[PDB]
């Protein structure tokens, strides 16, 4: 701000540090789970 | 695996032999039974 008579030491005392976390658009996966599964027990 | 300390004699003791028989797609038969039947009782 640094406008009126009294000021603040640094910008960090002007900010609200939120813990909210957001993520952008992710690539979808189609081949991961379209084929049926064949269980195994050996080489 | 042949990486551990002990291991087996051969792959025959590391395989499951399945008794299942599977076959690929086969060509169709069309002109075998589209014409009508003419019975005979002589040469």
TrEMBL record, chains A, B:
It is found in: Virion. Signal peptide: none annotated. It comes from the Viruses. This is Major head protein.
